[PDB]
Amino acid sequence: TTLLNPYFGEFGGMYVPQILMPALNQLEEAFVSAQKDPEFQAQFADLLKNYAGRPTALTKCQNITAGTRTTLYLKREDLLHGGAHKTNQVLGQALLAKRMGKSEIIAETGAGQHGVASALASALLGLKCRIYMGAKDVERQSPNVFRMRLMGAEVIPVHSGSATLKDACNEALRDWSGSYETAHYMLGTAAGPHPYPTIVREFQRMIGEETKAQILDKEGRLPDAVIACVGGGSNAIGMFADFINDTSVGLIGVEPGGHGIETGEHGAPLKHGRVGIYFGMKAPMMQTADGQIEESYSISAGLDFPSVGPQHAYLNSIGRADYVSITDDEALEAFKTLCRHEGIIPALESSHALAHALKMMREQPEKEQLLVVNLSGRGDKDIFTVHDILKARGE
Amino acid sequence: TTLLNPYFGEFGGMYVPQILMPALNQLEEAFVSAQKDPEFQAQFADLLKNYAGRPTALTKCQNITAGTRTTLYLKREDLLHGGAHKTNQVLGQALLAKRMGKSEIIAETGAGQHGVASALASALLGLKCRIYMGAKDVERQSPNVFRMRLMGAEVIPVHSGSATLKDACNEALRDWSGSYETAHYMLGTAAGPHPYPTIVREFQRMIGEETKAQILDKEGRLPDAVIACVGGGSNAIGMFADFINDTSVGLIGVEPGGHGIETGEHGAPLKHGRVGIYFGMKAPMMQTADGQIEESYSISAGLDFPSVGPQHAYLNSIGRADYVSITDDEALEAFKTLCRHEGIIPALESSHALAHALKMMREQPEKEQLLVVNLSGRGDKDIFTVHDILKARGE
Amino acid sequence: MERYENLFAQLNDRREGAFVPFVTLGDPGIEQSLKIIDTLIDAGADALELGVPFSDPLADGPTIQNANLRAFAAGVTPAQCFEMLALIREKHPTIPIGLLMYANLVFNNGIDAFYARCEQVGVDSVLVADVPVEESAPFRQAALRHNIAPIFICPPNADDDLLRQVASYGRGYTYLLSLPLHHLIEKLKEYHAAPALQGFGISSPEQVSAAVRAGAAGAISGSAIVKIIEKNLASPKQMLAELRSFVSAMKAASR
Amino acid sequence: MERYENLFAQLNDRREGAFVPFVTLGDPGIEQSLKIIDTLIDAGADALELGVPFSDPLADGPTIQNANLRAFAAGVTPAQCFEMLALIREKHPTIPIGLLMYANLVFNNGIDAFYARCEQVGVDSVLVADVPVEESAPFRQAALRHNIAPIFICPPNADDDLLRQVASYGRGYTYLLSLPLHHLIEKLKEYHAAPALQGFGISSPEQVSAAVRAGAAGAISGSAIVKIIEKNLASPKQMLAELRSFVSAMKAASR
Numbered sequence A, B: 001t002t003l004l005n006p007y008f009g010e011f012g013g014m015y016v017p018q019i020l021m022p023a024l025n026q027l028e029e030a031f032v033s034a035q036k037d038p039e040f041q042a043q044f045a046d047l048l049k050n051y052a053g054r055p056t057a058l059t060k061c062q063n064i065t066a067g068t069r070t071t072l073y074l075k076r077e078d079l080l081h082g083g084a085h086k087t088n089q090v091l092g093q094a095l096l097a098k099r100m101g102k103s104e105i106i107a108e109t110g111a112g113q114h115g116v117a118s119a120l121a122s123a124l125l126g127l128k129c130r131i132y133m134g135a136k137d138v139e140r141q142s143p144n145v146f147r148m149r150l151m152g153a154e155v156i157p158v159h160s161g162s163a164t165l166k167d168a169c170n171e172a173l174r175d176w177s178g179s180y181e182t183a184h185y186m187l188g189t190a191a192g193p194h195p196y197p198t199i200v201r202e203f204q205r206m207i208g209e210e211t212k213a214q215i216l217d218k219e220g221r222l223p224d225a226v227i228a229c230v231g232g233g234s235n236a237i238g239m240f241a242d243f244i245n246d247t248s249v250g251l252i253g254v255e256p257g258g259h260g261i262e263t264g265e266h267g268a269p270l271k272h273g274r275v276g277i278y279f280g281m282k283a284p285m286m287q288t289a290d291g292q293i294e295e296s297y298s299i300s301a302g303l304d305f306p307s308v309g310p311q312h313a314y315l316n317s318i319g320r321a322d323y324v325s326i327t328d329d330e331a332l333e334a335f336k337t338l339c340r341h342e343g344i345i346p347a348l349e350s351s352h353a354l355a356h357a358l359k360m361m362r363e364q365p366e367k368e369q370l371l372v373v374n375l376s377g378r379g380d381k382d383i384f385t386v387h388d389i390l391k392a393r394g395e
Numbered sequence C, D: 001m002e003r004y005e006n007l008f009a010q011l012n013d014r015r016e017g018a019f020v021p022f023v024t025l026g027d028p029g030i031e032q033s034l035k036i037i038d039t040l041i042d043a044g045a046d047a048l049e050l051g052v053p054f055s056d057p058l059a060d061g062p063t064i065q066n067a068n069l070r071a072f073a074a075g076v077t078p079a080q081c082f083e084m085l086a087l088i089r090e091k092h093p094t095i096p097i098g099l100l101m102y103a104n105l106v107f108n109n110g111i112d113a114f115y116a117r118c119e120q121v122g123v124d125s126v127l128v129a130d131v132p133v134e135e136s137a138p139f140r141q142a143a144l145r146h147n148i149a150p151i152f153i154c155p156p157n158a159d160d161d162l163l164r165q166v167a168s169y170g171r172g173y174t175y176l177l178s179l180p181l182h183h184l185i186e187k188l189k190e191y192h193a194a195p196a197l198q199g200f201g202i203s204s205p206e207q208v209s210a211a212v213r214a215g216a217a218g219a220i221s222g223s224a225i226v227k228i229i230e231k232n233l234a235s236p237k238q239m240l241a242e243l244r245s246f247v248s249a250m251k252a253a254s255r
């Protein structure tokens, strides 16, 4: 028995060992309670405003659309404290942890942004934070590992399996199964077992709510489409949620195409994977023909979650949202273009969303369209990667 | 003849070659005109709000003051686009450049933050940007150099003199003397020849204006003191300006003490230098006994300007503002403390201001005091430096 | 078939607990795994619990994580595991054979088809480690349609609702991971549950006798057998010797 | 003293322009600098303009930036420069000696004291490169109190107000950096300015004759002498030979 529906159509559920079910049920009850509690909402609002810096700007980008009939806005989650959208929902989940009387936080991270967000929230709110991270990721994300450590979090390398995000995901669930009486599992995306896809959406939905109010103020109408990258699904469902019932507004999610879908070296399970059951949910997976879970490949470290949130799989199945992919090279071009023409260095994750908006514009330059791209993070973290590529090419 | 007073008491002036006087006079006239122009003010406001992300948060920091009668707020210029306060006044100066019909920008930078701000503003507003940077600084600020280049700016290493900030300052003035018909010199601090100390203050004064409104809303009274680091003086005069006539509010500027004032390896000319004439102004200088200009030493790359803005020298002389110093070790402690206890990674420049507020608290823990520290920037840029120190110590 | 029913009837007649070792199929290779399993049986295993290597065994601790890595290093696939199962059953007609599976491997090519293959090779039960009773309906239904017992874990944080559901839904045995132990065991009996096997930290003979004394039908060694494999990789012969010594001692303790 | 007045009177009588070389004191060392300066004089320099090495010569291009670096490499200080000036004057009683200074070196130990030292060693003029007429009052006053001519630059972007101010404030000569050239020169005369020397890009004899033809009293070679030093560092003897050849040719062009 649950209070809320664990499924989005056929997708989602609570596919965990029996021992973890009480932890999920406890968390769902706490969330449902919190959502009706004006005191909780006020505390969350206070942290978002006065600590994280909400509301974030909605920036009109005039240079990049010159000579076309596209108007493009960027929702500036890159300006949130920590440098990405991840901060919003960690502050909400840290408050849920406290509501439940927990004093410890467990988190998984791949690229390190969710780990940093979890560590900063834990430091502010007096929680002891431990972060699982695949050993291969630890090795390639020394800067983020160091930020996490400066903020007092324990970073635990995971050597099992592929030593990447999925393996860190498993380790976090293993820990929580034993520790849930005192520890909360701060899952970093809109995926995993119920109630996480629901909680993460509700604690990211201010992205779309603010976007709607901002675009109404500036343009007097809703956007033709809102566009967001999809790794596990949090920034995209945060932008989409408040527009779901506005049926004229397109919802476009962009998965990483990597070296190209046809190479198989990508991270686009929603459109090019196969439904499976893993990490507590039934959803599209990167997996072998015989059902072993595989990694997502992308230039962008943050689009590495090898599945996708079940609400995205559902919105796609009913035709409410459309999902596309953007290759490494397309994302890199978009990165360069925004730096040079708007003076904003975007995360390479977010660059996938921008690349698709640029394609919408360039393909049909005399189509009148009002687009919003969710700029999920800043790209300071990516300048070394980009530097190394441009050198290798001979640029 | 000028429209405005070029001096703050005995400090300031226009000590440039005769050939540059028309450029300064032109800039002063354009500024005076712009300040009366509602269209200019609206364009500036639009960029600050919708591009840079103003207003910035005022964050109450509860953990670090626990068990004392200090209440400490941080003004969050670290959340501005670009990651420091430098962005505010570059947007205003880029608009002045356009007002004057200029299509090119020249800027100097030491640590690279002003260079990045100049490059981003130039990219957004369609100006061709060239940045002078001492060769020694270029070598040690490869990340910032690369951001500047990604944003389409030309970065020109300066090999003359000490190959640092002062030499880049000279080169920018040399260029401008020849190019001022088409180029604007985007000076990065509240120093140099009139009208720059005035313009930079007026284009940074929203820091203090917002702080005042925010603290009135949250506490119902003015702060006992506002505290800011002083390299050349921009972030500090931006915080101070709106409080100057509120005589109960302390104005505390913090210069870098480096290895300690007594070592002579510091950057605290206002309190420990000697008045001289250089870079277009009469002000306290780092200089030899026989009048050669010397470098400022600090852990923090950004507190390297070897003089100080003339309005600071004036406010000190009349007793309106007080200036103190903080050593490398004190700044590093403050950096660590804010990361661990508030989940905010501060610039090492800003860490000097925080260190002095922590000293005010710790020295007199039963003194009731309401303090604001200007957090001039984020400290992502500093994590390698900090990492390297902690390793060397054995931490 | 009725392999668990027949086993428990026989043990009950002999006033004897069951001892059930777990191993990962194909660890440390197919040939050696087949030999290990025959050694467990010869040494007195009453039933087997057998894992199929999976990329992401999020219910398993380090010992079994490493067994999976060894099996993968040997190139072991689920298809090869099913070939192994057919050979094991062909050699040993009465011993109950249970699988411990992850949901994705069951769902991958169709849940019904998975349980049909289990039936074809002569498997008796399947415990799906990441399917709680709340999500179990299609798995239990397919199991029962193909004469396979669906096995459920009764965890240490179980409540009365869960006890009733496990008692209703499970067959073969109840996997006890242990409310007081005496409470759980009596309540499972009260609710006519499949006989309980204690599965928590069973690594010594004393724990087998203790499980039986508490009123359980026997004990499952979830990782102790795998630890012996790990420790003896360099000596296949010594590995089999220690396995035999261990299983013999554990079985002796069930009397 | 009246060294510039006497020089211009003598040149006017000979229908002759002045040729004035610039060099940095102590470049490439004190001894060689003294020899360079004596060579310039022997070769026909009418007056000297002499720089004191400064850390931040923000009015100077690369040639002079590098001369300063060479002098600093030799350990040259302002005090040593003043010792040099006294020795130069002691050898050469009538030649006008002008300094090109940065404001900080003048202000450092007191503006009045700086001009008093200038008078003691026999300097005739000081041009402070980063002091525009607008800021010049304390410098001009101290200069005149110590019998030193304050020299001002009339730049290419000069206006009538500036021409009047320079004409009023300057003494010795006006430093012309060149409104049309004919306009500036006639207007300076109209306003009774100190005689004009053309200082922009004077690197060839033809430019000296051109300056005189335009109505200027002569020409200042702002960097050409320093370039010859730069090019001949490895050969002190060849350096002096080329310096002599160059100055002789430039002076010949003033007739």
Ligand SMILES: Cc1ncc(COP(=O)(O)O)c(/C=N/[C@@H](CO)C(=O)O)c1O
Pocket (backbone or CB within 6 Å): A084, A085, A108, A109, A110, A111, A112, A113, A114, A115, A165, A188, A189, A190, A229, A230, A231, A232, A233, A234, A235, A236, A301, A302, A303, A304, A305, A347, A349, A350, A376, A377, A378
């Ligand atoms: C800046 C940014 N944008 C988008 C995403 C994509 O995540 P959603 O789809 O929005 O949930 C990420 C993810 N990062 C994770 C995984 O490595 C992490 O940091 O641990 C990100 O850092």
Ligand SMILES: Cc1ncc(COP(=O)(O)O)c(/C=N/[C@@H](CO)C(=O)O)c1O
Pocket (backbone or CB within 6 Å): B084, B085, B108, B109, B110, B111, B112, B113, B114, B115, B165, B188, B189, B190, B229, B230, B231, B232, B233, B234, B235, B236, B301, B302, B303, B304, B305, B347, B349, B350, B376, B377, B378
């Ligand atoms: C984050 C930060 N805080 C404070 C200061 C100090 O400058 P004011 O005193 O506020 O003008 C700086 C300076 N940086 C200059 C010089 O290297 C630059 O980037 O070019 C800074 O980057």
Ligand SMILES: [Cl-]
Pocket (backbone or CB within 6 Å): none
């Ligand atoms: Cl409470």
Ligand SMILES: [Cl-]
Pocket (backbone or CB within 6 Å): A149, A150
């Ligand atoms: Cl640390």
Ligand SMILES: [Cl-]
Pocket (backbone or CB within 6 Å): none
């Ligand atoms: Cl509303």
Ligand SMILES: [Cl-]
Pocket (backbone or CB within 6 Å): A217, A218, A219, A220
């Ligand atoms: Cl409108």
Ligand SMILES: [Cl-]
Pocket (backbone or CB within 6 Å): A269, A270, A271, A272, A273, A274, A275, A284
């Ligand atoms: Cl699919």
Ligand SMILES: [Cl-]
Pocket (backbone or CB within 6 Å): none
């Ligand atoms: Cl206009």
Ligand SMILES: [Cl-]
Pocket (backbone or CB within 6 Å): B149, B150
């Ligand atoms: Cl580039």
Ligand SMILES: [Cl-]
Pocket (backbone or CB within 6 Å): none
């Ligand atoms: Cl007001």
Ligand SMILES: [Cl-]
Pocket (backbone or CB within 6 Å): B217, B218, B219, B220
């Ligand atoms: Cl109040």
Ligand SMILES: [Cl-]
Pocket (backbone or CB within 6 Å): B269, B270, B271, B272, B273, B274, B275, B284
């Ligand atoms: Cl002083």
Ligand SMILES: [Cl-]
Pocket (backbone or CB within 6 Å): C091, C092, C093, C094, C095
């Ligand atoms: Cl048998």
Ligand SMILES: [Cl-]
Pocket (backbone or CB within 6 Å): C138
């Ligand atoms: Cl199912």
Ligand SMILES: [Cl-]
Pocket (backbone or CB within 6 Å): C209, C213
């Ligand atoms: Cl007994």
Ligand SMILES: [Cl-]
Pocket (backbone or CB within 6 Å): D091, D092, D093, D094, D095
């Ligand atoms: Cl003489």
